[PDB]
């Protein structure tokens, strides 16, 4: 097939940039196993084996491919308009049952709080195992990305695009047994550093979320959490962000005001309702601190279904939520006939920059939050040095470990910074840097971090966008890793919360989300007293 040969073809250019820019090649062949090479010719298997050959299957084909490596930066995306979508939405419960949280609004004779049993006749459990990956590892993370797109399909990204009639054994909550015919929305087919940490994923998502209706806030990034209020609020703010007070009782009878905050995607630009010339998102997010700062006892921080972001404005916002400097780790990176590139203007741009007002004239006021300061551009100068040391000495195969930019800890925000206690909330769906944010706080013991396993470490990616002849829009491969002592930082990929708290069927099956909650207030309120958390009661 002439198909076959391109797709061949366009694959073992894949197969080269994962031998080229993909920080944590050397990493996945040990805790995975997985063998590139011998993954490359089940490759070859899949296409010459198949029958006259589709061009969106053999996408799929790759897609898999890339797919396998079980990096969430990682992936391939093309050209493709082709969708699938079922205008509803879905949580899973802590003992394993399935919830319709939201429909959109085509009024149909589904509604809230109805599990979810089978699709077509087949239990959801088994209609989502097909969704799954290659080296599908059984992880948490993974069975909600599965989920996720079990209602939302995408060409775009290789899902095998569905249409028409399709049955939906839902469940009343009377312990009654109904079945729904409903239709897909279908359509029809027609630098280095500076690049934002987020998974390929969202990119598309994020565009298909507007695109069609779905605008809900159980959405990655939505600005609005999906956690009811924690009580009876006292305050509130008409502004950009999600925030408001509220007076809580402990176990005696005792207010104290707490904090509610929810930072949801740290690519600031794409906050939902944001206006350019205004204020940005960061200069707005301190003033919500600085009436924290005075009028509240503690800090709940709800940071689920974050996506990631830009390192610097995640840097920034740190930057103000403590008194004292954070131990920020190193990351172990690929270099190209461009990083060093930009490198060589860091040095150039501030090379005579001795005074702290250099510093700013230079770098700015601020960079993307996070404020200038001569020990800034002493990082950066620090950094764009280091890229060279590790650049002409044969190791761009993983340079020494390095500090993103020249950051090695975090400065207070020397007007606003939050003295008080902070807990973070944090699940399954927080990449890239919505993983930065818990850790540092955790590496530093700042918070209190609480709910499920993030999603997966971050580190930049690379968007290569090549000439193909198979759709290959872009692929975006993982091109830093984060090391410990002097390395091999994993075992997991997650920062694991101090207190682990899935969500009780009880909290999702009337969008009350109320032992949930209560468990945090509590936790909370242990801190308030002193600090440290004893127990889990």
């Known amino acids: 097939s002439l198909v076959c040969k391109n797709a061949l073809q366009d694959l073992s250019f894949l197969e080269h940039l994962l031998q080229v820019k993909y920080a944590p090649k050397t990493w996945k062949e040990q805790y995975l196993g997985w063998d590139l090479v011998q993954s490359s010719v089940s490759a070859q298997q899949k296409l010459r084996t198949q029958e006259n050959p589709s061009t969106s299957f053999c996408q799929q084909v790759l897609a898999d491919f890339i797919g396998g490596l079980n990096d969430f930066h990682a992936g391939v995306t093309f050209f493709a308009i082709e969708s699938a979508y079922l205008p509803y939405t879905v949580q899973k419960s802590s003992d394993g049952r399935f919830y319709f949280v939201d429909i959109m609004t085509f009024s149909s004779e589904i509604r809230v709080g109805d599990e979810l049993l089978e699709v077509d006749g087949a239990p959801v459990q088994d209609v989502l195992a097909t969704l799954y990956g290659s080296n599908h590892k059984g992880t948490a993370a993974e069975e909600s990305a ?10 775009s990204l290789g899902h095998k695009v569905p249409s028409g009639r399709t049955t939906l054994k839902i469940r009343r909550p009377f312990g009654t047994t109904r079945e729904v015919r409903v239709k897909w929305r279908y359509v029809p087919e027609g630098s280095l550093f500076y690049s934002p940490m987020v998974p390929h994923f969202w990119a598309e998502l994020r565009n298909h979320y507007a695109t069609s209706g779905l605008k809900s ?98 840097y920034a916002l740190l930057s103000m939520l403590t008194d004292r400097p954070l131990e920020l780790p190193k990351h172990r990176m690929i270099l190209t006939q461009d990083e060093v590139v930009d490198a060589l203007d860091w040095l150039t741009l501030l090379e005579n920059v001795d005074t702290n007002v250099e510093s700013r004239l230079a770098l700015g006021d601020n960079m993307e939050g996070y404020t200038v300061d001569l020990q800034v551009a002493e990082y950066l100068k620090s950094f764009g040095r280091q890229v060279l040391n590790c650049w002409s000495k044969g190791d761009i195969e993983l340079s020494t470990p390095i500090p993103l930019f020249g950051f090695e800890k975090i400065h207070p925000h020397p007007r606003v910074q939050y003295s008080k206690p902070i807990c973070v909330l944090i699940n399954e769906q927080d990449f890239a840097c919505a993983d930065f944010f818990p850790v540092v706080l955790k590496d530093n013991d700042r918070a209190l971090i609480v709910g499920t396993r993030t999603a997966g470490a971050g580190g930049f990616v690379f968007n290569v966008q090549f000439p193909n002849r198979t759709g290959i829009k872009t692929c975006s491969l993982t091109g830093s890793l984060a090391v410990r002592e002097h390395g091999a930082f994993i075992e997991n990929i997650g920062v694991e919360p101090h207190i682990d708290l899935p969500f009780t069927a009880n909290d999702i099956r009337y969008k009350g989300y109320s032992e949930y909650l209560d468990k945090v207030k509590k936790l909370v309120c242990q801190l308030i007293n002193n600090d440290g958390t004893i127990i889990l009661a």
Do not use: C
Not at 146 to 155: D, Q
Not at 289 to 311: K, R, Y
């Open 146 to 155: 599965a989920l996720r797109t079990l209602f939302s399909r995408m060409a």
């Open 217 to 314: 806030g159980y959405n990655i990034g939505s600005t609005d959490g999906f956690l009811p209020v924690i009580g009876p609020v006292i305050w509130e703010s008409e502004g950009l962000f999600r925030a408001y007070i509220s007076s809580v009782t402990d176990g005696d009878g005792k207010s104290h005001k707490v904090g509610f905050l929810r930072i949801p995607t740290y690519s600031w630009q794409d906050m939902e309702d944001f206006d350019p010339s205004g204020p940005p998102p960061w200069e707005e997010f301190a003033k919500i601190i600085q009436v924290f700062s005075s009028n509240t006892e503690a800090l709940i921080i709800d940071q689920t279904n974050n996506p990631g972001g830009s390192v610097l404005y995640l």
